[PDB]
Amino acid sequence: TEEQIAEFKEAFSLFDKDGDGTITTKELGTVMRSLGQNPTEAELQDMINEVDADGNGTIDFPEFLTMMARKMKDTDSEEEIREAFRVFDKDGNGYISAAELRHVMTNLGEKLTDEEVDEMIREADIDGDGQVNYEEFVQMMTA
Amino acid sequence: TEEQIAEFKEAFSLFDKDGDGTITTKELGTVMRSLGQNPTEAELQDMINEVDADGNGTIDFPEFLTMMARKMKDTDSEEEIREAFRVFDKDGNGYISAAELRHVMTNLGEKLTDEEVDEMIREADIDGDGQVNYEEFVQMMTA
Amino acid sequence: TEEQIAEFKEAFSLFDKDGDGTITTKELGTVMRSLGQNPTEAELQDMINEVDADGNGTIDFPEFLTMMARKMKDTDSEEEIREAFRVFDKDGNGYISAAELRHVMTNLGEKLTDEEVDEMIREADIDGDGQVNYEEFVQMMTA
Amino acid sequence: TEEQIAEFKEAFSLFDKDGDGTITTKELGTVMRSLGQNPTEAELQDMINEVDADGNGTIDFPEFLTMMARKMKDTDSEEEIREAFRVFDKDGNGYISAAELRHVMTNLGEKLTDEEVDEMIREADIDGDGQVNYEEFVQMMTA
Amino acid sequence: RNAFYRKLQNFLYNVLERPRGWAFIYHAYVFLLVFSCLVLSVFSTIKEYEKSSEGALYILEIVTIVVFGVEYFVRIWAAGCCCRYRGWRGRLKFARKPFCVIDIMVLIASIAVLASALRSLRFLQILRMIRMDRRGGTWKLLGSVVYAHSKELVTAWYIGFLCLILASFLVYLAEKGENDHFDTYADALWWGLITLTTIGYGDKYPQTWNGRLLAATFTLIGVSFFALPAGILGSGFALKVQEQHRQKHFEKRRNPAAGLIQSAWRFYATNLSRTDLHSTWQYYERTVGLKVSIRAVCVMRFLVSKRKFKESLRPYDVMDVIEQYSAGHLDMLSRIKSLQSRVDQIVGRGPAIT
Amino acid sequence: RNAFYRKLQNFLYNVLERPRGWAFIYHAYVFLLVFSCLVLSVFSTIKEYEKSSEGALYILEIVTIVVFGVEYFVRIWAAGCCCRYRGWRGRLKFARKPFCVIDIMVLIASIAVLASALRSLRFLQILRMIRMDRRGGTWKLLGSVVYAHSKELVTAWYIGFLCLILASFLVYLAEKGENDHFDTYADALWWGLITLTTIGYGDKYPQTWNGRLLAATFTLIGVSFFALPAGILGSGFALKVQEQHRQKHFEKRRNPAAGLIQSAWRFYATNLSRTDLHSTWQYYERTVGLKVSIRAVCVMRFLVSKRKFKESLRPYDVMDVIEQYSAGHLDMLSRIKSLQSRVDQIVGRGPAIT
Amino acid sequence: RNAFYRKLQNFLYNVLERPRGWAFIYHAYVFLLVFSCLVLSVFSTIKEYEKSSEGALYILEIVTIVVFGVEYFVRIWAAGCCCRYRGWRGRLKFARKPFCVIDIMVLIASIAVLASALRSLRFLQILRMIRMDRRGGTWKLLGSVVYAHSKELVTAWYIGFLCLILASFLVYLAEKGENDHFDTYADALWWGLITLTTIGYGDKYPQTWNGRLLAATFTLIGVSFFALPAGILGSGFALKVQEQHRQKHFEKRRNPAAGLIQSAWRFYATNLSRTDLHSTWQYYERTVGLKVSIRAVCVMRFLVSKRKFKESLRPYDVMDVIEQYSAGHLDMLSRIKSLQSRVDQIVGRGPAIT
Amino acid sequence: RNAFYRKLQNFLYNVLERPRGWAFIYHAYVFLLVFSCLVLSVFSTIKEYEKSSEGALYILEIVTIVVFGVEYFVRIWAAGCCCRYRGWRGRLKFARKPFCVIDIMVLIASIAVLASALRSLRFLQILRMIRMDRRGGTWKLLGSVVYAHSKELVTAWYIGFLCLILASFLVYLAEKGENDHFDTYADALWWGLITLTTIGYGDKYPQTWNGRLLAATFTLIGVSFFALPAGILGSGFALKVQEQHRQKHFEKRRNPAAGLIQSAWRFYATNLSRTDLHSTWQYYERTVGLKVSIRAVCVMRFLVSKRKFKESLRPYDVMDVIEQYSAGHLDMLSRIKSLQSRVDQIVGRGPAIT
Numbered sequence A, B, C, D: 001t002e003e004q005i006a007e008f009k010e011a012f013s014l015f016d017k018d019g020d021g022t023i024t025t026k027e028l029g030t031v032m033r034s035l036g037q038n039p040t041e042a043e044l045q046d047m048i049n050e051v052d053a054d055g056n057g058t059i060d061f062p063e064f065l066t067m068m069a070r071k072m073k074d075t076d077s078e079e080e081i082r083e084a085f086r087v088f089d090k091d092g093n094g095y096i097s098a099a100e101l102r103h104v105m106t107n108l109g110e111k112l113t114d115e116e117v118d119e120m121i122r123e124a125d126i127d128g129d130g131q132v133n134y135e136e137f138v139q140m141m142t143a
Numbered sequence E, F, G, H: 001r002n003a004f005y006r007k008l009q010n011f012l013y014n015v016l017e018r019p020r021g022w023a024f025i026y027h028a029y030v031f032l033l034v035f036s037c038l039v040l041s042v043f044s045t046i047k048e049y050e051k052s053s054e055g056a057l058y059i060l061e062i063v064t065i066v067v068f069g070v071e072y073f074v075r076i077w078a079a080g081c082c083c084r085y086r087g088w089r090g091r092l093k094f095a096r097k098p099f100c101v102i103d104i105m106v107l108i109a110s111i112a113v114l115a116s117a118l119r120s121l122r123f124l125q126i127l128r129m130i131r132m133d134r135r136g137g138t139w140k141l142l143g144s145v146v147y148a149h150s151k152e153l154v155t156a157w158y159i160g161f162l163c164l165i166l167a168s169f170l171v172y173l174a175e176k177g178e179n180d181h182f183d184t185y186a187d188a189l190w191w192g193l194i195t196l197t198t199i200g201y202g203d204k205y206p207q208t209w210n211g212r213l214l215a216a217t218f219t220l221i222g223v224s225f226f227a228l229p230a231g232i233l234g235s236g237f238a239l240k241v242q243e244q245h246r247q248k249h250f251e252k253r254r255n256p257a258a259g260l261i262q263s264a265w266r267f268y269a270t271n272l273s274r275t276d277l278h279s280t281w282q283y284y285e286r287t288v289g290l291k292v293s294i295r296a297v298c299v300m301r302f303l304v305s306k307r308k309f310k311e312s313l314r315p316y317d318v319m320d321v322i323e324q325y326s327a328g329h330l331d332m333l334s335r336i337k338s339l340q341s342r343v344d345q346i347v348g349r350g351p352a353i354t
């Protein structure tokens, strides 16, 4: 809404330092390394392209508010998350043991801190089993 | 109805120049090159054959009125158009960018003039996104 | 019912010439040759075996009445007939031209006389098209 | 409930001879050979691992009573039993002859006594056909 | 007698023409006879074995010629069985085929020779050996495989020819003077050929160490590229034979499909209750309480035919099951579309019933 | 003792008959012994090595003969283990098998020789080498592969034979006078053979340039067609071995399926609440608070057996998963048909409830 | 005339550039001419054939040079057809391509030689033979296959080289003194190479029995590993050609897809009842009762184009049909999800209507 | 500096250990250096080239030894990077590995020789050439392929050995007296070996016509069975390389799957409205209006990671897509089962609402 629009304006000002209404790859890079993460030029190019819809190398405010309002229900990531967990389900049981989650979560991809896996199991081990049904996890993430 | 039946009488008279009730491949060729398009003898033969049902090399009026009343919903072209757009969807996203449509529509098959692509995007870009969901396009073309 | 049971008793007496309650393959051969069709010993044996349920080489009355009451809906021949017609549908259009039926019906398997194909087209060309939709044919045969 | 809890306590005492609340593989072997069946060390290890949930090499009471209350409908063995019977259905008819059951039930896997196959046919030949539909059988074990 | 005469004519034509079982045994025996004749000719060429070899060859060749004559006469006399060729006119029309032209030319040349002849005998023997095929199956298969793998074969030829030319020229340069084997570039080309094919006669071989090194470096690649076509042809032969077997399987599927449809229609049109079914009863009458027996016959034939067709739908391939199951998948799509339409009807009624 | 005697008999029969693990090591060792015997015979044929070679051969052959005798005696004495053959009568009945005939004939010939002998020794050694197979597996595989690729192999033979004949004849014509290697067509045929096979002894080679050109033009094609069978046989061997492995996989699937069905029925019939289940409790009593323990062990057996069977359902192939999933697709068809029937019921009720 | 001039220029450029039909016949004829030139040169190298060979070679080479020059001039003059190169400037720009550099260098070398020359003639012949390719198709295919199977080829090279080195060294040790063929390790290496490749010249072979035993034991493995690359390359060639054919099939699919979409939109926008469709009517008007005739034309075109595209969707592969059917499977997922949503609506209404 | 020191140590260790890009170029250059050393040794064995060959070999070998020493020292000094081995103790622990034992033994032997030497130099050169592999990849691949095709290879060996023995014996019988090449069965066996392998040295060949005929009849089959292993090994090599590539593809799939799950959880736990999410905000705070910017970063990362993973789910195979789609088919089973349950609820309500 209007208040969300103002928040998005503050966010755009944070990103679009130049204030020209277009986020440059260097602006996003500097804000990233300010956040403490160092991206690569090609990685940031793929990033902006994944958001870029006008083919300009930047993002205008309408696209930024589109990404902000883009709920992950629309993204249709159910199949993708299902496939990822199936990839990590070495048995095909339809679940995955907690220990495997602890090992993979903090050792693969963008390794997460122990806090992230703790909240993962908190919102995943609803039945307190440890052998979380990944399908249920993606369903609750969707819901 | 009867008025459409008389319209089809006029159309057949335009096609069946000889007036014998049978459209000859030469009649189709002459009317085609009058329309400004030059077909090949084998091309026109396959044309009539795909429309021919009595295996005579021509078309009696009942077949002509059948093709006239033959709405494309009966034809069941949903799967065919789906497959065509998927072929042109190099990513498999379920959509296709407007620029790719501009390039393809006027470069392969029977190239269409800029007006045709303009009306295509007009009736396809219902959400004004450019990344037209070809599923929606075939669904509306069917509906 | 009882009257059908008596009809089946007459049929069994016609088959079981010996009257012992067991139809012998030789008795089936004699009745077939009387009918004008000559089967082979192995053909008749595999045939009764497909009919045989007690593994005795003959048939008792309960099996004969079972096959008499065996409606083809129970047999579940929808898929088999579908596959056969698809095999004979060289184009995959979901139909088959009348001329192809005339050629195949009287030249393959147990060739049928012109009368049989005439009744086939009569009960098949419900719409009088000739390009019978074999799905419809199997559905009506089931219905 | 409470009475079933007491029954499971008696069962655990019968299993957990040491009384420490943890069933040892050696205790399981002793109780098995008391039952008259001789398992192997690796066999019993995989056995407990399948029944184990805490990854300790033994079983605590909660896992034991969860397994005891674990109904087979939850186990979802419909597909597995279907596949097994399909494997033993060399024709794919959707059924299997009684004699094949007599041969297989007492010759492969854990051979069963003639009484077991007798009860199998008793609960299988509900229609007294012998060619039991394995799908119906698994459906009945599920219900 | 007369019917038996036509039956025997047809059976012997089948033996002589496309064989399946024991006719193949007869064809193998005649092939063995002609092969023995060729071997005896080759032996007769040997000087120390000439006398006995030729003595046996004369009688074996008269036996071969009598067998060939009786076979050709039986072919002409049995050519009338097929509907294409009937009577004396039909047999004479069939005799005009190019293969029969080859057979008759071989026969007349052989009888003229029997009634410098060694070269003519060799040519005639080669011609009959070629004649053994009778269907061009081997030649057709080889041509199909060559055409299918035309690009790979031509690439192998181009690369191997360039390698041969370059290696021969380089070794000739490196062995022009020192070695008398390579006094001319043609000799070097002969050496390069008999090396890259790995024949290695030994009449010509490099002796200078520069030549030896060049020969090594080029012969590795050359033998690889010269052995390529054997593997290419093996793969092509296997693929084409598998394709032919698949087509044969599909025809063996086609016939029982007709059987099943025929029996299904007969059983559906022989129903006792239904009327206007005389079109089917007349057939069983002209073939000849009886009605129920005929119905039992028909339904029982339907059962056996359905079994035959179902067992005839063997997978035989991944693509085959994929297509068969895709038919059912399209059927499922249609059924779910129908359910969607019915649910649309229900949701339309919901507001109305409320 | 007695039970141990039968157990040892069966174990040693398994070692001597179909081996799996260390029995294969024993078979390899006896194979090595016989191979060393053959190598020592070949060495003894060498004149300069005759003395020591024969000296070692005598002792190694006595060792071989005692090993063979003890093996045959153990085979006869362990032939009673199987249910087919039991007791002295059963062992004697088993000894009648053709392979035992070969073994006993070799044994008696060897003992007669030990107790112009070089040729007999060679024959006996070849016979025992053939005897090493014990199952005809190699011969069966070769025959199956040859039969499977009969058309390709026969086409290769026909084309290669025609090429050999034509090339030999043409080179013979081109080198009849100039070259003394090709004075007779038999010599030319020998040359063509040793060329098209790429053996190239060098005893006969073309020298006239017409002969060289013809030899080149024909040897390219000839070597291709002569190397074809090696690739064909390799592909066939691989295919047949894969097929046998697939069949073994399916049998290893069959057994755990029986295990799973057995355990499932036992678990379902050992339910506490249900009655008339004595047919299952009696089995556990014969094997032998106890009721609940029996139920627990039965259900846990069911879990482990289901795990085993599920692991046993490995794809192993595209067709395998295609078939397994087609079963589920047919199940889907049935379920959607049931839903169609229920929706038909609903739409029929719609007018009634309106 | 002028339009005919441009049409002929384009047709001849297509003939010279990527050919399909009879232009391939012309290319084959010019290839045969150049191959005859090379063969005549090789013959001229033969001393006894020098006179007539060179006499014919001179005239055949003048014919070759005139054909080559006219072809090059026609290539330059027809290079203006393509939009990339137009006019004299465009033709000169195209002439800069490396292949035209090779062609012009060959032309100038030939004209200089014609207007120790044997070696230059041979080099020019080889260069033009290489020039025959005109697309690098063979070289590109070979490079792609080598790169794809780099690991297998390198492993074969490593193992075969180790085997060659070890076998040559061992035989050299076993035959250092007894045999004069192996007086130096280089000689033994040459023997090992001409043995493992199975060339077997026969100039060097082991004669001591230790040498013969080592040679056999090592040559088995060595010939296996040296013949490996031929099969590897054959398989790679077949795989790459199949991949290229699949890509071509997919492009032949791409074009009729555009045709179908074009015709479908035209037919949907030529509907008589619908308005605001002049955007399509103007096309037909500019190409030129007429309205209905145009609509009939459009629907007819839609039918024929749909037939063309549907035929263009041939399986051609397991993966192709799997992908096509997976599209429909995802569609089925969507439809069943919609039905689930509608059933959720119904179950929510259930309590409400009650 | 210090961090740069560790980074350079890790980079150089990666260069020496598993290389990907330019480290492969360095390895190729050192391999070329050692290969040139071996070639120069072989040249030095040639008598006429001894002087200059040895002169260059001395300097090239000193260059080789300094390069090897620096490489080994850098390996030991960079062995501390890996967590397995750190510090001087870790480096010394790593040096105990058998490959380092081989390298150090070669180094010490070379330095002792430099500071009858020809044979030691040869042995050391072969040892370092073997050392070039550094991973046993070629040996592991060959062993895996041999084990996989053990049955086919053993059958080929058995049949080929029987053919060789029988052919040699028969030819020996046919040429015992007439030909002096076959005076002993060992000579006949040598002939059979050099024929069936198609080496054909030509030192021994049959000359009697019975011998020639037997040799032909047996060498056809023998060369087929002796060329079998080359094709078998080629197919095995290709299959194993494809399998390894498939496994690598699946690992490259595994990593982006974790990336996608990570980003999805991060973006689901960075939602602004939801509470109890500080467990994720703390991570971003440690890395360091900021809330919304962080959420934008997170959703963007989720989008890019989903794109990466979806692209990573390439088919790559028929089985791969079959498995992926079978997952969805099981999902369809579950959904249709849920719909069946809901329709059962509806039909149960039907009587209630009526």
Ligand SMILES: C=C(C)[C@@H]1CCC(C)=C[C@H]1c1c(O)cc(CCCCC)cc1O
Pocket: E219, E220, E221, E222, E224, E225, G146, G153, G154, G156, G157, G158, G160, G161, G164, G225, G226, G227, G229, G233
């Ligand atoms: C371009 C071809 C055909 C390959 C790839 C490039 C190279 C390194 C050699 C070819 C090749 C051989 O020609 C022969 C062998 C067998 C071992 C030879 C011993 C030195 C392997 C081997 O890869």
Ligand SMILES: C=C(C)[C@@H]1CCC(C)=C[C@H]1c1c(O)cc(CCCCC)cc1O
Pocket: E146, E153, E154, E156, E157, E158, E160, E161, E164, E225, E226, E227, E229, E233, F219, F220, F221, F222, F224, F225
């Ligand atoms: C009918 C066969 C078997 C093929 C196809 C037709 C032709 C042109 C040759 C055969 C063939 C060779 O016989 C040998 C090579 C290797 C290079 C030879 C160098 C001249 C390639 C090569 O395609």
